[PDB]
DNA sequence: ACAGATTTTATGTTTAGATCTTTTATGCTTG
DNA sequence: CAAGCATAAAAGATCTAAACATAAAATCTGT
């Protein structure tokens, strides 16, 4: 036997065939009815999803408690009639319906900022169009959702499509050629229309610039009956990635999504709480279980001004629906925490919310902690920050050699020999209190404090072997450090 | 807890702390520990003494110096842990895992978990110490490797019968401070004093020096049949003290270098021993005084085979490097003053090939023409460069022909000087301006 | 005596935190944070509600300990309703994270009652199909340590999947990301930030010295009947923590002002409480705290002045000469020949002032130079010590540095310790103190 | 660099030993540690540095120090051959003093050349 | 036509070669 | 002449593409 120059024993290769669909049938006239075959399309193999479903199921439960705000928290999540995206819904639905009843291939490229309903509205369009197809108004079709960012490698998205339209398992190259031959040579008589939702096209293109070209070119063929719904963040992704000539020779409907305004977000929140706002609940003081219409009737409502101010605050910065939903849910959670803090209901006469709770949640989301992180640091940390600020003010280079920091600290701690803190901090800071410890060149906690600041993302030190001349910058803005040092009680004295 | 503290020579506190931390009870033993200290500070020695004084607790000894990268380190960790567990409990029925199956830290986590679950029939909680002796001495070291081993203990099962505790060993005290905020208990090992190192050398070397065959041969040859082991111990201790007092200022406090010097100088010292000398401590010092003044640690027992033309090319290259071009014409008119900063102490300057050839022609003596540059001159220059004597100013893939490459001499003053006297060409003449 | 041995073992076990759960000592300043984390994890496991959270704080800020305490407390009663999957951002890379998640899923599923087989893409699709998709659902509680490595600059493939998974999937999911950076939200890209629950709870900090002394009292006061000495020892400690002038309180003040890290004080106390051989020794050592001073001296005994006091005479002379040359130079750089020239001028001046000092030769000062640069007193001209990660270290290993090829004499160095500090350290009685300044 | 020196040396050792003697082992110095157990024979490795002047002496010195660690086995003996071209002055100048001290215990200056002796 | 021989997809592992960026060794230049 | 001022080139961080390398599944070849 040979002697291996290096061994990889963790290799695991999937059982995927290599022969593309071109050589499978040996004749274009020999292609059978691909619509009705045992394995093609969604005609088999639904057992796997049922195999893993029972894996996480348990057989034990013990009197779960659903409080008054549990219903609100469960109905306000992002898991679940969209009113604010009706125009784009209608446009994309009209495009898809025209392409599906005319037996033609098209591409709809929709782009927008994260969390504005783009994926939700396209999924709603596909669901409604599938429901219409169930009424036998258009030829039947299969929906294949190919999420770009839910894949280990970008070239995976080919084989998935094949595995979802052909039941076979092929490698990415064989999948490419098989899909091209199926979209180019198979006659329209023996094919079923395919709708592909290339979610998060941004992650698919990267360095390859192959996925997007293949998917926007497969819709050009007349034989192919494909309706590619690509969705992305940047509106100019195609024209940049493919080039003006290609994006012109491919005619695809472009849609842009704008972030919701405050009125739209308020409407979304109100619609998601139509069944719970101003409702009567039966609650038992023994455990706190709430039942929707010792038992007490409690009225639950969410203040309109709180929703309005939350929507105004969240829409003015991003307009993302998910952030508004999450901040409202956090306000409800704060109210519920106060509820069991006052009552003590545990687990296993009008209750409402207030603008104070929403404001608390918004402040938690927005306000940073660096100004609060400095003010609770050790004395040596604030001394180090003070010396850094002093040297930055003196030199103006917004970066300082570390040995120069040490020298400034020593000078600062020796000039103020009469300050009421310094004469007793100097001993514990240079000799660590006890004798028998010689005068230390650096502070006692110098390495500890330097690493504490570097780890906390609050100070950047370039990598150098010479600890004397390595330079450190303040990642945080200089105003924060000055405010933090002003908040101290003894640093401002000296 | 109930562990025995061994008796070491000058590491009382270090061994007290080491016994305080290391213990056979995994509940009261830190999951990480660092014996930090420089070379010769005696940390492997005291650690080995501790682990030989408490055989009831088990350890695995590793040397990351031999395991250059991190992947061999992981593979060796897995293999040695498996082998030690098999040796300790041969009665447990266990399947083997190939040590070469681990290639990432996650695979090491999985392999350690799989080895530890199959040893679940142990009666009592057992801690296994994995001594990464020399972790900082890794040749593929980087800042983001130690903390992998720091946080490794979190990924292993909490309730497993066998718990692996790490005992690292680094020697830099600037690599350690990078992780100073991890607050992992550590035992810093200070260096050794002159008296301490002398005592250690006496303790660790008098037996070997007394039991030298050379000394026995010298005694039986010189016929001194009145001696005791006390006399030999005294003479060995006197030699150790003499060598320490004579070379401590030169060697510092490194025990290894002092051991090398002792091994080097003992044969001559014992060869200079005669009848009345041995019974007089000052006789050896006054008679073998040569050994104890000048150190001898170089290969030359106590130049270039280049051609004449290559030697002159080297001399011309050095002259070009260490002379200002604007002074070349004035100095070499062979057919405000000079600087006294002694540029021979600074890095050699960069010159051009044409200047080198011109000054080489200027300095070459007339034979039989001025030795017009021919194939031999250029071949000798290229051979000098491939000997790394005339280094260029560009990285690999060098092209000597581009008019953007410059040459600089790559020998110090000593080599070029003694080459100059080798060919009997004056070199402290053109540098007489700079003395 | 066995009583003191049992008390010592119990006390040191209390110090190390390995004390059994339901009686673990919890400090009074992180009780609020513990209640918050308990609220989150119980609201997620008991009520099967999925949500995410990122813990932030310095190293050894009691976040892994707090989460482990919560899991241990909640596992002794409700063990069949949740499976714990823990990833560490240091050892688990981007590719290996999927393998680790699959392995831990299959292991916990086997324990409570395949996935990991196949290629990595098959593994990822399998775990996604499994988990993303009267009785309840076994909640999968994720625990990310150092989530800032998974945060990444560009890809963020795993975080997006897991946050969309906690936002949209059916099985209840927790994900606790224990990271260090304060600006953790700036690391996550726009989509992952939108998916993230936008909830971060910051680790509490020691705001008052009273908090630290109360924490130390809670940590070091054994509160159970194990040994006959427990009745005595406790009150002793109380006395030592009642008088402000007491030595242990002074050391607590020192730690509060310098480190403000309780684990450092605990690592100091452990050898103090393990060295004592009887109860009298333990009492007198906790009264005197001499071993704390010994420990502090040992910790600092090797950094830069413990190093400096181990230099021999010639080594100190060469160090001083090199410092002189560095200070005289404009950029602080020097080399072997300049340092030796200054050293020989210094020794000649001293001898002319005159017992006789042997001016060591070049070939005998070369060894001192190598030892001095080996003790990290000098550094190369522009040399980076340790690279940030493995790729950069590999790139550097393949490259050939210029300073390596330059001969030994002409290698240009730089100084760790300036001449002024060298004067500040060296005692006045030393015979080189005259040349320690220009 | 040092790691590739070691990997090449261990690969050559394994290949030659297996060819003489007619599972796998990772390429590291522990192959020398396990050699007596693996092949039931003593070892004698002879390192021939072809052009010792061209190698940057930092990595050569590190490799020699690494090889020094292989003397705790009492069944392996090592022999080094340095194909020096210029003289020992450059070797003394470049190599660390500790490495020269370690080499000095057994060295043999052998003058082999076509131009020597006439 | 069944096991061996070759291929196809899928990495890991070193060597040779590239451009960016930072610093600093060169010139330009009055007396 | 040096300082100022400018461009220039050395030293190295950071990276990629190619040569060299192994390996498991599926295809292609002869009895
Ligand atoms: N028109 C709408 N009516 C009601 N709720 C909405 C509406 N649009 C968005 N939402 C809510 O906000 C969420 C947005 O989810 P998606 O639309 O999938 O996010 P997205 O816009 O695709 O962002 P990505 O995936 O980051 S590009 C929905 O799941 C709902 O919870
Ligand atoms: N306390 C001691 N008592 C006796 N001998 C000692 C002592 N300390 C060191 N030695 C001697 O030192 C030598 C061993 O040195 P090591 O302990 O290996 O040094 P080291 O610092 O561990 O080496 P590194 O760091 O691994 S290069 C032997 O000669 C020991 O006898
Ligand atoms: N398994 C454990 N059981 C009890 N206490 C522990 C355990 N592991 C660590 N600790 C203690 O936790 C404290 C250190 O804080 P940890 O939470 O462990 O680290 P951390 O705060 O998570 O820091 P990281 O991991 O670097 S972000 C010390 O008191 C440790 O002794
Ligand atoms: Mg989406
Ligand atoms: Mg050792
Ligand atoms: Mg952790």
């Amino acid at each position: 036997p040979v002697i291996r120059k290096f061994t990889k024993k963790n290799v695991a290769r999937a059982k995927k065939k290599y022969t593309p669909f071109s050589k499978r049938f040996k004749s274009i006239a020999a292609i059978p009815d691909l619509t009705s075959l045992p394995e093609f399309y969604g005609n088999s193999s639904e057992l796997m999803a049922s195999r893993f479903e029972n894996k996480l199921k348990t057989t034990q439960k013990h009197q779960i408690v659903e409080t008054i705000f549990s219903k609100v928290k469960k109905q306000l999540n992002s898991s679940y009639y969209l009113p604010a995206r009706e125009n784009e819904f209608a446009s994309i639905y009209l495009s898809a319906y025209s392409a599906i009843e005319s037996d033609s291939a098209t591409t709809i490229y929709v782009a927008g900022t994260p969390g504005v309903g783009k994926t939700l509205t396209v999924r709603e369009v596909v669901k409604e169009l599938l429901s219409s197809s169930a009424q036998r108004e258009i030829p039947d079709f299969l929906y294949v959702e190919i999420n770009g960012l839910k894949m280990v490698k970008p070239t995976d998205c080919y084989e998935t499509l094949w595995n979802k339209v052909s039941g076979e398992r092929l490698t990415w190259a064989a999948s490419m050629e098989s899909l091209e031959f199926y979209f180019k040579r198979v006659p329209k008589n023996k094919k079923k229309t395919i709708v592909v939702l290339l979610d998060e096209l941004d992650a698919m293109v990267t360095k390859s610039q192959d996925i997007m070209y293949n998917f926007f070119n497969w819709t050009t063929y007349e034989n192919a009956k494909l309706i590619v719904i690509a969705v992305a963040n940047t509106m100019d992704l195609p024209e940049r990635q493919l080039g003006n000539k290609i994006t012109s020779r491919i005619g695809f409907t472009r849609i842009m999504f704008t972030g919701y305004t405050h009125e739209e977000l308020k409407n979304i929140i109100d619609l998601r709480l139509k069944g719970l706002n101003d409702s009567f609940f039966y609650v038992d003081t023994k455990t706190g279980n709430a039942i929707l219409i010792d038992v007490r009737k409690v009225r639950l409502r969410m203040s309109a001004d709180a929703i309005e101010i939350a929507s105004r605050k969240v829409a003015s910065v991003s307009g993302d629906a998910r952030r508004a939903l999450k901040v409202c849910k956090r306000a409800a959670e704060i109210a519920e925490k106060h509820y069991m803090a006052k009552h003590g209901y545990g687990y296993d006469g009008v209750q409402t919310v207030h603008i104070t709770h929403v404001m608390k949640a918004l402040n938690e989301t927005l306000n940073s902690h660096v100004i609060t992180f400095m003010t609770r640091l050790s004395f040596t940390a604030k001394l180090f920050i003070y010396a850094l600020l002093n040297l930055m003010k003196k030199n103006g280079s917004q970066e300082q050699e570390l040995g120069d920091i040490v020298d400034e600290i020593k000078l600062l701690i020796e000039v103020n020999g009469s300050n009421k803190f310094v004469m007793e901090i100097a001993k514990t800071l240079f000799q660590q209190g006890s004798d028998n410890i010689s005068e230390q060149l650096r502070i006692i906690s110098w390495d500890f404090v330097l690493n504490q600041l570097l780890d906390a993302g609050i100070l950047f030190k370039q990598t150098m072997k010479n600890d004397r001349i390595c330079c450190v910058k303040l990642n945080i803005s200089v105003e924060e450090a000055k405010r933090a040092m002003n908040e101290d009680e003894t640093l401002r004295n000296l | 807890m109930n562990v025995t503290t061994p008796e070491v020579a000058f590491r009382e506190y270090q061994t007290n702390c080491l016994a305080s931390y290391i213990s056979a009870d995994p509940d009261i033993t830190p999951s990480n520990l660092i014996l930090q200290g420089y070379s010769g500070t005696g940390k492997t020695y005291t650690l080995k003494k501790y682990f030989n004084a408490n055989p009831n607790l088990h350890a695995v000894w590793l040397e990351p110096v031999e395991l250059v990268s991190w992947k061999p380190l992981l593979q060796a960790i897995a293999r040695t842990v498996q082998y030690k567990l098999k040796t300790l409990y041969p009665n447990i029925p266990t399947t083997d895992y190939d040590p070469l199956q681990v290639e990432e830290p996650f695979l090491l986590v999985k392999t350690l978990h799989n080895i530890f679950v199959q040893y679940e029939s142990l009666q009592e909680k057992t801690c296994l110490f994995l001594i990464l002796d020399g972790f900082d001495s890794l040749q593929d070291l980087d800042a983001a490797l130690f903390n992998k081993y720091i946080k490794l203990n979190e990924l292993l099962p909490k309730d497993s019968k066998i718990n692996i505790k790490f005992i690292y060993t680094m020697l830099e005290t600037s690599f350690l401070q990078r992780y100073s905020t991890h607050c992992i208990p550590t035992v810093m090992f200070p260096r050794y004093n002159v008296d301490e190192v002398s005592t250690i050398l006496v303790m660790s070397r008098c037996g070997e020096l007394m039991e030298d065959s050379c000394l026995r041969k010298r005694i039986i040859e010189e016929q001194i049949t009145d001696c005791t082991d006390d006399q030999f111990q005294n003479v060995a201790a006197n030699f150790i003290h003499l060598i320490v007092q004579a070379f401590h200022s030169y060697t510092g406090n490194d025990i290894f270098a002092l051991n090398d010097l002792i091994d080097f100088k003992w044969p001559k010292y014992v060869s200079r021993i005669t009848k009345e000398n041995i019974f007089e401590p000052l006789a050896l010092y006054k008679s073998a005084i040569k050994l104890f003044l000048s150190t001898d640690d170089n290969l030359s027992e106590n130049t270039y085979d280049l051609s004449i033309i290559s030697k002159y090319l080297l001399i011309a290259s050095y002259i070009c490097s260490y002379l200002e071009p604007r002074y070349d014409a004035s100095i070499f008119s062979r057919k405000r003053k000079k600087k006294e900063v002694n540029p021979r102490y600074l890095q050699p300057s960069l010159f051009a090939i044409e200047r080198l050839l011109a000054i080489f022609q200027a300095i070459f003596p007339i034979q039989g023409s001025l030795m017009k540059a021919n194939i031999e001159v250029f071949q000798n220059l290229s051979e000098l460069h491939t000997l790394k004597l005339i280094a260029t100013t560009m990285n690999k893939n060098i092209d000597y022909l581009s008019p953007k490459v410059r040459w600089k001499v790559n020998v110090p003053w000593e080599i070029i000087k003694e080459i100059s006297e080798s060919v009997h060409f004056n070199i402290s003449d053109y540098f007489s301006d700079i003395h | 005596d066995p009583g003191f041995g049992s008390l010592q073992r119990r006390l040191l076990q209390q110090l190390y935190g390995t004390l059994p759960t339901d009686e673990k000592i919890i400090f009074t300043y992180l009780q609020d944070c513990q209640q918050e984390i308990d609220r989150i994890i119980k609201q997620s496991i008991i009520q099967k509600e999925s949500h995410s959270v990122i813990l932030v704080g310095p190293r050894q800020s009691y976040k892994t300990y707090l989460l482990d305490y919560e899991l241990s407390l909640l596992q002794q009663s409700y063990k069949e309703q949740f499976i714990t999957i823990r990833l560490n951002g240091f050892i688990h890379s981007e590719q290996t994270a999927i393998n680790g998640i699959a392995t831990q899923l299959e292991q916990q599923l086997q324990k409570i009652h395949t996935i990991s087989s196949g290629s990595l893409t098959e593994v990822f699709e399998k775990i996604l199909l499994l988990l993303d998709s009267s009785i309840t659902k076994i909640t999968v509680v994720f625990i990310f340590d150092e989530i800032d490595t998974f945060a990444g600059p560009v890809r963020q493939t795993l975080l997006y999947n897991l946050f969309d998974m906690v936002e949209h999937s059916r099985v209840p999911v927790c994900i606790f990301g224990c990271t260090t950076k304060l600006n953790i939200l700036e690391y996550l890209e726009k989509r992952v930030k939108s998916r993230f629950s936008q909830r971060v709870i910051y680790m509490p900090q020691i705001q008052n010295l009273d908090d630290m002394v109360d924490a130390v009292r809670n940590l070091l006061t054994v509160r159970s009947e194990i040994s006959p000495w427990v009745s005595q020892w406790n009150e002793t400690l109380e006395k030592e923590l009642s008088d402000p002038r007491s030595n242990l309180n002074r050391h607590i003040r020192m730690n509060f002002e310098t480190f403000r890290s309780l684990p450092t004080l605990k690592n100091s106390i452990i050898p103090l409480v393990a060295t004592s051989k009887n109860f009298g020794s333990l009492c007198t050592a906790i009264k005197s705290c001499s071993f704390l001073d010994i420990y502090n001296k040992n910790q600092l005994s090797n950094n830069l002045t413990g190093r400096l006091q181990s230099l021999s005479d010639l080594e100190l002379a060469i160090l001083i000469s090199a410092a002189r040359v560095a200070l005289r130079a404009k950029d602080g750089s020097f080399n072997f020949n300049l340092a030796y020239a200054e050293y020989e001028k210094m020794i000649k001046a001293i001898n002319s002032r005159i017992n006789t000092i042997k001016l060591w030769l070049k070939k005998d000062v070369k060894n001192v130079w190598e030892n001095l640069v080996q003790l990290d007193f000098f550094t190369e001209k522009s040399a980076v010590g340790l690279r940030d990660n493995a790729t950069a270290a590999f790139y550097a290993s393949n490259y050939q540095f210029q300073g390596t090829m330059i001969p030994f004499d002409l290698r240009s160095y730089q100084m760790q310790i300036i001449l002024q500090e060298l004067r500040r350290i060296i005692p006045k009685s030393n015979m080189y103190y005259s040349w320690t300044q220009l | 660099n040092v790691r590739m020196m070691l990997r090449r040396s261990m690969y050559k050792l394994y290949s030659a030993a297996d060819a003489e003697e007619h599972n796998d082992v990772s390429y590291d110095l522990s192959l020398v540690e396990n050699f007596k157990r693996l092949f039931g024979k003593d070892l004698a490795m002879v390192f021939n540095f072809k052009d010792v002047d061209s190698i940057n002496f930092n990595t050569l010195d590190n490799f020699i120090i690494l090889l020094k660690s292989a003397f705790k086995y009492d069944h392996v003996k090592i022999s080094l051959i340095f194909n020096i071209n210029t003289n020992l002055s450059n070797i003394e100048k470049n190599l660390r003093q500790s490495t020269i001290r370690l080499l000095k215990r057994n060295y043999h200056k052998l003058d082999v050349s076509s131009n020597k002796g006439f």
Side-chain angles (χ1 to χ4, degrees), chain B residues 87-150:
Chain B
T87 296
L88 291 203
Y89 314 119
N91 50 76
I92 308 294
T94 49
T95 186
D96 59 339
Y97 298 85
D98 213 6
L100 315 171
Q101 209 148 31
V102 58
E103 298 199 343
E104 289 100 1
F106 154 67
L107 277 296
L108 185 135
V109 170
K110 182 173 72 68
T111 289
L112 270 295
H113 179 104
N114 281 354
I115 289 174
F116 288 169
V117 291
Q118 81 176 352
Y119 278 105
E120 203 49 46
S121 54
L122 267 297
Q123 197 273 332
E124 66 157 56
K125 291 279 288 299
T126 294
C127 78
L128 191 149
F129 298 105
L130 183 63
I131 301 164
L132 287 162
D133 187 66
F135 190 87
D136 193 57
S137 196
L138 207 70
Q139 272 88 19
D140 191 74
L141 197 41
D142 62 358
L145 172 62
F146 181 46
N147 58 8
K148 283 177 195 167
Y149 292 101
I150 290 191

Side-chain angles (χ1 to χ4, degrees), chain A residues 60-73:
Chain A
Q60 178 58 246
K61 195 253 191 180
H62 206 46
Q63 53 195 340
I64 196 182
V65 162
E66 217 171 346
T67 185
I68 185 168
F69 284 136
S70 284
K71 315 296 197 297
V72 170
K73 281 185 286 193

Side-chain angles (χ1 to χ4, degrees), chain A residues 73 169 326 336 466 468, chain C residues 39 43 122 194 196 416:
Chain A
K73 281 185 286 193
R169 299 170 59 81
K326 278 180 308 186
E336 189 276 331
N466 197 244
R468 157 78 47 180
Chain C
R39 184 55 141 74
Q43 205 178 192
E122 270 184 340
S194 161
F196 176 51
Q416 294 297 109

Side-chain angles (χ1 to χ4, degrees), chain A residues 78 82 114-120 200 260 268 272 321-322, chain C residues 195:
Chain A
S78 306
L82 72 164
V116 307
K118 51 163 71 43
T119 289
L120 165 74
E200 297 319 313
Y260 301 85
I268 294 316
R272 213 180 273 280
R322 265 191 292 217
Chain C
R195 254 93 177 168

